[PDB]
Design a protein around this ligand. Structure first.
Ligand code: CLA
Ligand code: CLA
Ligand code: CLA
Ligand code: CLA
Ligand code: CLA
Ligand code: CLA
Ligand code: CLA
Ligand SMILES: CCCCCCCCCCCCCCCCCC(=O)OC[C@H](CO[C@@H]1O[C@H](CO)[C@H](O)[C@H](O)[C@H]1O)OC(=O)CCCCCCCCCCCCCCCCC
Ligand SMILES: CCCCCCCCCCCCCCCC(=O)OC[C@H](COP(=O)(O)OC[C@@H](O)CO)OC(=O)CCCCCCCCCCCCCCC
Ligand SMILES: CC1=C(\C=C/C(C)=C/C=C/C(C)=C/C=C/C=C(C)/C=C/C=C(C)/C=C/C2=C(C)CCCC2(C)C)C(C)(C)CCC1
Ligand SMILES: CC1=C(C/C=C(\C)CCC[C@H](C)CCC[C@H](C)CCCC(C)C)C(=O)c2ccccc2C1=O
Ligand code: SF4
Lengths: 159, 740, 98, 143, 80, 165
């Protein structure tokens, strides 16, 4: 009974990963598989809505807190939010450019989830699917920026 | 089991192999057809692995090589003692250490060098030294030049004995491989014997010799009437008045009454206010405790009498489930590979030299050493660089072991094999933390520079603006300051004045004062962490990818030091681990240069200075908290605010430092030929010069060839490092001599 | 695949090359049903990459043109404020131009 | 060789641990290489992309992302154990190619069964200057 | 990929094919040398240009020449 | 008095430089007793300074607007005016020794090349032949001229390795 925790993935010592407790932990695997980017059956626009909402809510913070007008009261909370919205628009433009670039061809080989049972094709791995994903990303980012804006207006604590 | 296996007379003592310079290598034994034969001769001179495949002859060779290096170091130490005996002002410096600068090198009046014999005081002229030998000769109680002469002659005698020992232990009586493989006996004899016996001998010398001399020296007694240490050794009456516990006479030692020895084996924190160094009683109890700790640790391993520890059992027994086989074969590697042990010993030696430099700058262990700013700066910088060099060489010899002495038979699922297995993960995570540290240190510096340039100092990362306070380091400082209050109640004061609340000063100059840490110290420390992470990334990648890689799978069969595998795969230049060490040398140079720049600026701006009645005034204006946050502030207020004495050193005692500065600039700049360029252009130029020498029949029999690509890289890195080291040496020494 | 020691079969080469989704599930419409059509109608007018590249550029050029023309001098950016009296003369070694 | 051999899917693989150096996404998208050999006993070898692996008594199978890894393993096996293995190439669509000698008795021999290709009967340095082949699309060494 | 050319100066020490870890070079029978052998490059599309055959070539000038240019996914030595 | 340079004997800046050097050298003299060995070394340095300033003057040397002596390089101008000792005679003085080293290196190269395995002779020097050639190289230009006319100095390029362009 050696308890060989460190083993290759699927018992295959030939490929990149080896199954490690950073990867093979049930909590980590359940948390990563439940993240929106790995919900393959869900439409890519619904993926992008949640992803853009989370990222646009987080990206507002550093702009308000450490912006050039952070010492000016009342105006930092609007300048940080519109700069975060501009950053979300820049990331949406780069996302659309990546969708144009990486999906001008067609993939031919599946993903092969563990012990088989693969679906035909991820809609995220398509051209119009990634375009819908980027659309959901920019809508989610704008809504998250506006939500972080109104959370800086009504507040019981800090900002 | 452990015995002395020695083969008598394996090699005849004759100059037969001295007659033919190329004899260690069969490739060089033919003749010097090309000019690269000479560089291969001086390069493979001490590479004993390709001289022969027998480990026993290699072990004998390296044993006598260490004997020769020991004899060389003993010759150098004897020469330093002779210089202090003959050409020095040590007698004058003993009677006045705070006003007479140390000097132990006297130049000749041959060509204009009389200006280098500076007026160091005490009616003596010479080169103002910086090694701090006078402080050491004041700690170890030395009064007259007769004693230094005796020490020099004894060092010369021991150096001759060491050279004779090397000759004997190679040519006359060479030990066998089983003699060198007695690792347990080696460890026991170099733990209890070497370290423990030396620590106990030094503790006894400090107790019986150095303590009374240093007790009479700081009391105002002139050294002329100070009794010689043999009088203290033989006579208990003279040693009894200075230390009353000697009247007991070894009674408390055997009767377990060691509390009676609290007069000359004290436990005091801080420095002696009269001299500025550590208390000699504290050092005596320290070296005695170190001797105890090494005597007990030197009886751990099992050699011949059953009891003890077997290192193979200790390694094979520590096996943990995320590591598979745990330290399974490392005893077999370390008992058969000289390069693996060389890597381990060089890494630990370099790190311990770094600790030595840090803990001398922190607690000065010598009398009148803290006030002598030049000796402290020189010791810190020198041991800093020697530690860095030993660490880089450790990486190099680890890569050499990886290429040559590593075999896959003994290791299947051990720690070394698994480190080889997940090397890409290690390199990628190290690259991530490298990029992360580089950005949020140097981009912070660039952002501070930009906000200074944009006229917005309130947006900078400074103490006046938004700050990154090093809370952990300041908390450690406060804990160590309050450590004698609760956690070490028997300590008189804090272990160092880095975190203290009092300022000591000898001769009107600040010896050691409390150090404040701010945003700038945070930035420089994380810059240091970034730089060290990059250098360790380069060295570890070179070690890991020396055997095989995704680019070149057969890098193991191509040797350790090879230039390239050709322009294939887009060009595999500098792919060898030797070139990884070649780049790591420059990264080491950048790391240690920035480290010693931080040391010099911080100590000159917040520690070193002259004490006044109205507060304490430092050497600079205390601008480290205001100018070390930006690159331009660093430049202007450290490299331009200082070095004004180096340029104006001409016509004075320190003009040789300016000459050395410009020669170092020359050599540093001359290296970039061997760094930027290649070999084919130089080979074609050499062909044209060969045609020129062929036209009028002065063609050498040896064909002139350009330097090899590895040879050119070695010349470039050597000239670059020598130039940079001498540049910083000249600048630091001239600044600290003309000011401090 | 993976019977006792084999890792290659040439008819299920999707398993041979190591293409595996370590974190992949096929659970459809995890969010509540009324929530999708609010955002599904949000994306359909901007789902096309032509509509999205235009919209980002439309909000790009207009807001960039808004900054400086109207965006500056309302935030009191220190570029359209003007000096009080600084830096008319230049030259510490004499000459004193301007 | 006498008959071109086709690799068997059934053949075992050496025991090995998880190594980061191995097959990448190029194995999925583009082609990858497969090496086969028949062993007399259980010996320890070092993979060109990983650490050490104990191989199986009998047939064996290695997958390498590059042909250079395959020939490095081949040269290591031939030098250490006089092993004489062979490797293949497996494409993305499942096509199998044989690159290790089609004649079967290695490039070191001749076998009088292969035709000289990319061979110039002129001496090196007798090639024409690039001006003589300018604006033609053919290099002087390609003639 | 790269262009590998072998000239008539080859005399057949059958060592340029051992120094190439990519199976680019092969040896064909010939009649212009004592060893009756001549280097050939059938799989010239699999060459990366590492010039190890040039290091192994003992003739002056070299019989085998490798010319760089027109790089591809196999001549660049990427496993990705 | 050529190129606007006054002679060193009649230059005010030359004497001001001498007075400045004597002042700083005597500044260090006040920190030592006259019967000490650093005092004797400083006195010898001052004597060497005074001897150098005296010998540099009254020798035809000149200086201009700096107090530092200048050297005249043009031949003829350094011959009509007494300035040949600056660079004109050191030119032939160096060339004699420079041709000495080149000649003895050539004779050693020629002598070693007519010997079995001559590459060893470059790393294994022989003392009696090298020292004999070292003391038989005083008449280097006389040996150089006679070899130039008869072709033993030079070599036709039909046995000289030339580039293949
Ligand atoms: C207690 C016994 C003892 C002591 C004190 C030493 C001391 C030393 N050994 Mg060690 N050694 C021992 C036992 C001992 N050895 C045993 C039992 C073995 C066999 C397993 C070895 C095998 C060994 C090897 C293979 C090597 C050493 C080396 C060294 C030196 C390292 C240099 C250094 O760190 O600077 C300290 C330097 C000094 C203290 C300078 C003074 C040196 C004095 C003259 C040596 C006196 C100690 C000696 C044991 C006295 C007896 C010898 C007698 C025949 C004259 C050091 C002097 C290295 C070496 O070659 O150096 C000799 C080395 O590579 N040792
Ligand atoms: C930050 C860099 C980094 C990273 C990400 C890894 C990652 C890994 N290492 Mg490595 N390692 C590193 C640096 C790193 N290493 C360094 C610097 C050394 C010293 C040379 C080692 C020495 C080492 C050994 C000796 C072994 C690993 C192993 C492992 C694996 C198991 C780790 C694990 O889940 O433990 C559990 C983690 C937590 C519980 C948290 C994993 C792939 C093991 C392996 O090969 O996997 C099978 C193994 O045996 N590592
Ligand atoms: C514990 C100390 C130690 C020991 C025992 C060894 C032993 C060895 N090393 Mg290691 N090494 C060390 C420290 C050590 N090294 C350090 C600190 C470094 C970092 C710089 C290296 C870097 C290093 C590399 C990169 C390589 C070795 C190699 C070697 C081998 C042959 C070395 C040789 O023949 O040099 C011959 C001696 C010389 C060339 C003389 C050194 C001259 C240097 C270049 C200039 C010194 C200038 C000086 C500082 C100032 C003078 C100024 C000038 C104007 C006069 C041998 C196994 C080589 C090898 O093949 O390993 C198997 C190899 O490739 N080592
Ligand atoms: C001071 C000189 C210098 C600098 C800055 C660099 C920079 C770099 N080298 Mg190099 N290096 C140099 C000299 C230098 N090199 C020399 C002379 C050698 C030969 C010995 C090497 C040897 C060497 C090795 C061996 C390695 C590096 C690596 C690196 C990288 C470290 C990145 C990092 O962590 O920092 C963070 C990044 C920087 C400091 C770059 C500047 C960033 C500024 C602050 C801009 C910030 C963002 C900016 C606003 C973006 C601009 C946008 C614009 C386009 C509109 C980086 C690309 C390592 C690497 O690849 O990374 C792990 C590595 O392994 N270098
Ligand atoms: C300022 C940018 C912008 C623009 C130009 C539009 C414009 C449009 N959206 Mg939209 N929308 C926006 C922001 C914007 N919206 C935001 C911030 C949200 C919240 C996430 C939505 C959520 C939303 C939904 C859920 C739907 C629309 C729909 C529509 C269309 C009808 C107008 C309507 O019902 O509004 C609202 C029109 C094409 C509807 C549509 O196209 O129906 C076919 C529809 O289904 N949008
Ligand atoms: C190429 C090198 C060179 C150069 C640039 C000069 C330059 C000069 N020489 Mg000079 N000279 C040289 C080589 C050279 N010399 C050599 C090799 C010798 C033989 C030793 C002489 C011998 C020589 C004599 C004997 C004299 C000069 C004089 C002159 C000056 C006037 C030139 C002239 O024709 O009057 C200008 C005519 C314009 C039409 C001028 C400064 C003369 C001089 O010093 O002027 C007072 C003078 O009398 N030269
Ligand atoms: C005595 C031997 C000798 C002789 C006659 C020459 C002669 C020549 N060399 Mg050569 N040279 C030599 C040795 C020699 N060289 C050596 C040892 C080196 C390596 C450092 C060079 C490197 C060298 C270069 C790189 C170049 C020349 C050039 C030249 C030409 C210009 C003249 C000159 O002074 O060059 C200058 C020569 C040097 C700076 C080299 C000085 C090295 C010392 C003085 C030589 C020591 C030799 C030794 C004492 C002889 C042994 C004596 C014997 C009794 C044992 C001329 C044809 C140049 C050329 O092509 O012009 C057309 C040129 O570019 N030489
Ligand atoms: C006195 C001057 C030197 C000796 C002159 C006589 C001479 O060369 O005899 C020649 C003798 C022996 O002569 C030998 O003969 C052999 C057979 O022909 C080989 O030619 C040897 O190369 C040759 O040296 O060598 C010496 O005396 C060597 C002198 C010492 C080496 C050169 C001087 C080094 C000075 C610095 C180091 C020592 C201090
Ligand atoms: C920052 C670098 C983090 C590296 C994490 C992996 C360490 C390497 C690793 O996985 O080591 C595994 C080790 C436990 O494995 P075992 O106990 O079986 O191994 C112990 C024997 O090697 C003895 O766990 C740790 O070291 C925990 C602390 C990690 C920090
Ligand atoms: C530095 C130097 C020097 C000098 C000096 C010296 C070095 C001297 C001597 C010294 C010595 C000479 C020392 C000694 C020491 C000793 C010791 C340290 C001891 C110890 C001991 C122990 C550890 C133990 C013991 C015991 C006991 C306790 C009990 C009983 C048992 C017994 C006996 C075991 C010289 C010149 C030389 C060289 C160079 C350098
Ligand atoms: C300059 C240069 C050369 C040419 C340098 C050579 C051939 C080495 C020359 C060494 C000399 C001959 C050592 C001796 C120097 C002087 C002769 C010493 C004079 C001493 C006085 C007392 C006379 C290379 O070969 C090279 C190779 C690879 C990368 C870069 C370079 C490179 O930069
Ligand atoms: S430039 Fe030099 S190091 Fe780089 S591939 Fe060419 S020959 Fe090798």
């Amino acid at each position: 009974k050696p308890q060989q925790v460190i083993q290759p993935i699927n018992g295959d010592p030939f490929v990149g990963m080896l199954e490690t407790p950073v990867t093979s932990a049930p909590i980590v695997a359940n948390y990563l598989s439940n993240l929106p980017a790995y919900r393959t059956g869900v439409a890519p626009n619904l993926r992008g809505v949640e992803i853009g909402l989370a990222h646009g809510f987080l990206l507002a913070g550093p702009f308000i807190k450490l912006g050039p007008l952070r010492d000016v009261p009342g105006t930092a909370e609007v300048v940080g939010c519109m700069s975060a919205a501009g950053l979300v628009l820049i990331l949406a433009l780069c996302l659309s450019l990546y969708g144009n670039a990486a999906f001008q061809n067609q993939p031919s080989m599946g993903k092969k989830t563990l012990s088989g049972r693969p679906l035909p094709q991820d809609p995220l791995m398509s051209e119009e699917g990634w375009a819908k994903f980027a659309a959901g990303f920019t809508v989610g980012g704008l809504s998250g920026v506006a939500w972080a804006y109104i959370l800086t207006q009504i507040l019981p604590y800090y900002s | 089991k452990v015995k002395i296996a020695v083969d008598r007379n394996p090699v005849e003592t004759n100059f037969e192999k001295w007659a033919k310079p190329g004899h260690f290598s069969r490739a060089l034994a033919k003749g010097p057809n090309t000019t690269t034969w000479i560089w291969n001769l001086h390069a493979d001179a001490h590479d004993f692995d390709n001289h022969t495949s027998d480990l026993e002859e290699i072990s004998r060779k390296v044993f006598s090589a260490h004997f020769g290096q020991l004899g060389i170091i003993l010759i150098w130490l004897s020469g330093m003692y002779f210089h202090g005996a003959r050409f020095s002002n040590y007698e004058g410096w003993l009677s006045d250490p705070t006003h007479i600068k140390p000097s132990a090198q006297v130049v000749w009046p041959i060509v204009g060098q009389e200006i280098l014999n500076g007026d160091v005081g005490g009616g003596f002229q010479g080169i103002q030294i910086t090694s701090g030998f006078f402080q050491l000769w004041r700690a170890s109680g030395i009064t007259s030049e007769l004693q230094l002469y005796s020490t020099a002659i004894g060092g010369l005698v021991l150096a001759a004995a060491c050279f004779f020992a090397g000759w004997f232990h190679y040519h006359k009586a060479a030990p066998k491989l089983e003699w060198f493989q007695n690792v347990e006996s080696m460890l026991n004899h170099h733990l209890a014997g070497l370290l423990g016996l030396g620590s106990l001998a030094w503790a006894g010398h400090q107790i019986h010799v150095s303590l009374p001399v240093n007790k009479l020296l700081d009391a105002g007694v002139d050294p002329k009437e100070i009794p010689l240490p043999h009088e203290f050794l033989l006579n208990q009456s003279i040693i009894a008045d200075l230390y009353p516990s000697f009247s007991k006479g070894l009674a408390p030692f055997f009767t377990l009454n060691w509390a009676e020895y609290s007069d000359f084996l004290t436990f005091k924190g801080g420095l002696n206010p009269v001299t500025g160094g550590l208390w000699l009683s504290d050092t005596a109890h320290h070296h005695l405790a170190i001797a105890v700790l090494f005597l007990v640790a030197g009886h751990q391993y099992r050699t011949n009498w059953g009891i003890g520890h077997s290192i193979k059992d200790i390694l094979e027994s520590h096996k943990g489930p995320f590591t598979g086989n745990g330290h399974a074969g490392l005893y077999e590697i370390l008992t058969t590979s000289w390069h693996a042990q060389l890597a381990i010993n060089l890494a630990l030696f370099g790190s311990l030299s770094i600790i030595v430099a840090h803990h001398m700058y922190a607690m000065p262990p010598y009398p009148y050493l803290a006030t002598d700013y030049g000796t402290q700066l020189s010791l810190f910088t020198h041991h800093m660089w020697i530690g860095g060099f030993c660490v880089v060489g450790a990486g190099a010899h680890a890569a050499i072991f990886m290429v040559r002495d590593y075999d896959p038979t003994n290791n299947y699922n051990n720690l070394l094999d698994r480190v080889i297995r997940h090397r890409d993960a290690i390199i990628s995570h190290l690259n991530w933390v490298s990029i992360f540290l580089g950005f949020h240190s140097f981009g912070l510096y660039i952002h501070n520079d930009t906000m200074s340039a944009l006229g917005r100092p309130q947006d900078m990362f400074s103490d006046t603006a938004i700050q990154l306070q090093p809370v952990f380091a300041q908390w450690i400082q406060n804990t160590h300051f309050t450590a004698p209050q609760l956690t070490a109640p028997n300590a008189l004061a804090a272990t160092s004045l880095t975190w203290g609340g009092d300022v000591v000063a000898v001769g009107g100059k600040v010896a050691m004062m409390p150090i404040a840490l701010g945003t700038s110290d945070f930035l420089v420390h994380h810059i240091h962490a970034f730089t060290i992470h990059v250098t360790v990334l380069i060295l570890l990648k070179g070690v890991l990818f020396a055997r095989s890689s995704r680019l070149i799978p057969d890098k193991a069969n191509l040797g350790f030091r090879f230039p390239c595998d050709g322009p294939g795969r887009g060009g595999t230049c500098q792919v060898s681990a030797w070139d990884h060490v070649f780049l790591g040398l420059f990264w080491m140079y950048n790391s240690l240069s920035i480290v010693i720049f931080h040391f010099s600026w911080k100590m000159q701006s917040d520690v070193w200075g002259t004490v006044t009645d109205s507060g304490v005034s430092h050497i600079t204006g205390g601008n480290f908290a205001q100018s070390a946050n930006t690159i331009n502030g660093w430049l202007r207020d450290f490299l331009w605010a200082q070095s004004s004495q180096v340029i104006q050193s001409y016509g004075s005692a320190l003009s040789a430092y300016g000459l050395m500065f410009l020669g170092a600039h020359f050599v540093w700049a001359f290296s970039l030929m061997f760094l930027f360029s290649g070999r084919g252009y130089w080979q074609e130029l050499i062909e044209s010069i060969v045609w020129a020498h062929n036209k009028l029949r002065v063609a050498p029999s040896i064909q002139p060839r350009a330097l090899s690509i590895t040879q050119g890289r070695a010349v470039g890195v050597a000239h670059y490092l020598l130039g940079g080291i001498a540049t910083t040496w000249s600048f630091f020494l001239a600044r600290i001599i003309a000011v401090g | 695949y993976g019977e006792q020691s084999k890792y290659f079969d040439l008819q299920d080469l999707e398993n041979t090359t190591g293409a595996w989704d370590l974190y992949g599930v096929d659970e459809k419409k995890r969010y509540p049903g009324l929530q999708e059509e609010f955002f599904q109608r949000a994306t359909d007018a901007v789902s096309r990459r032509e509509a999205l590249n235009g919209f980002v550029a439309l909000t790009g050029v207009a807001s960039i043109a808004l900054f400086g023309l109207k965006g500056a001098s309302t935030l009191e950016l220190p570029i359209t404020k003007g000096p009080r009296m600084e830096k008319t003369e230049n030259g510490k070694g004499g000459i004193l131009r301007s | 060789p006498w008959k071109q051999p086709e690799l068997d899917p059934d053949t075992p693989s050496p025991i090995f641990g998880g190594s980061t150096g191995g097959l990448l996404r190029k194995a999925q998208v583009e082609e990858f290489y497969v090496t086969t050999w028949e062993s007399p006993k259980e010996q320890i070898f070092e993979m060109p992309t990983g650490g050490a692996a104990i191989m199986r008594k009998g047939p064996n199978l290695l997958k390498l992302a590059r042909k250079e890894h395959c020939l490095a393993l081949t040269t290591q096996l031939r030098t250490k154990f006089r092993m004489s293995p062979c490797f293949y190439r497996v494409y993305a669509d499942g096509k199998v190619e044989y690159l290790h000698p089609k004649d079967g008795v290695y490039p070191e021999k001749v076998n009088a069964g292969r035709v000289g290709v990319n061979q110039n009967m002129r001496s090196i340095g007798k090639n024409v200057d690039p001006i003589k082949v300018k604006f033609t699309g053919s290099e002087p060494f390609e003639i | 990929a790269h262009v590998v050319k072998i000239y008539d100066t080859c005399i057949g020490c059958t060592q340029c094919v051992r120094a190439c870890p990519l199976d680019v070079l092969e040896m064909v029978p010939w009649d212009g040398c004592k060893a009756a052998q001549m280097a050939s490059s059938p799989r010239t599309e699999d060459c990366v240009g590492c010039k190890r055959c040039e290091t192994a070539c003992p003739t002056d000038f070299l019989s085998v020449r490798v010319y760089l240019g027109n790089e591809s996914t196999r001549s660049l030595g990427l496993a990705y | 008095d050529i190129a606007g340079l006054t002679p060193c004997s009649e230059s005010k800046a030359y004497n001001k430089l001498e007075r400045k050097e004597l002042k700083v050298l005597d500044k260090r003299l006040k920190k030592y007793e006259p019967g000490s060995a650093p005092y004797l070394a400083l006195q010898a340095t001052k004597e060497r300074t005074e001897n150098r300033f005296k010998t540099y003057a009254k020798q035809g040397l000149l200086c201009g607007n700096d107090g530092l002596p200048h050297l005249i390089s043009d031949p003829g101008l350094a011959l009509r005016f007494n300035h040949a000792g600056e660079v004109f005679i050191p030119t032939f003085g160096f060339l004699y020794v420079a041709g000495y080293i080149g000649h003895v290196g050539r004779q050693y190269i020629i002598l070693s090349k007519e010997d079995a395995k001559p590459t060893d002779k470059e790393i294994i020097l022989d003392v009696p032949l090298a020292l004999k050639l070292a003391f038989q190289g005083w008449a280097w230009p006389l040996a150089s001229i006679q070899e130039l006319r008869n072709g033993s100095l030079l070599e036709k390029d039909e046995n000289i390795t030339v580039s293949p362009r």
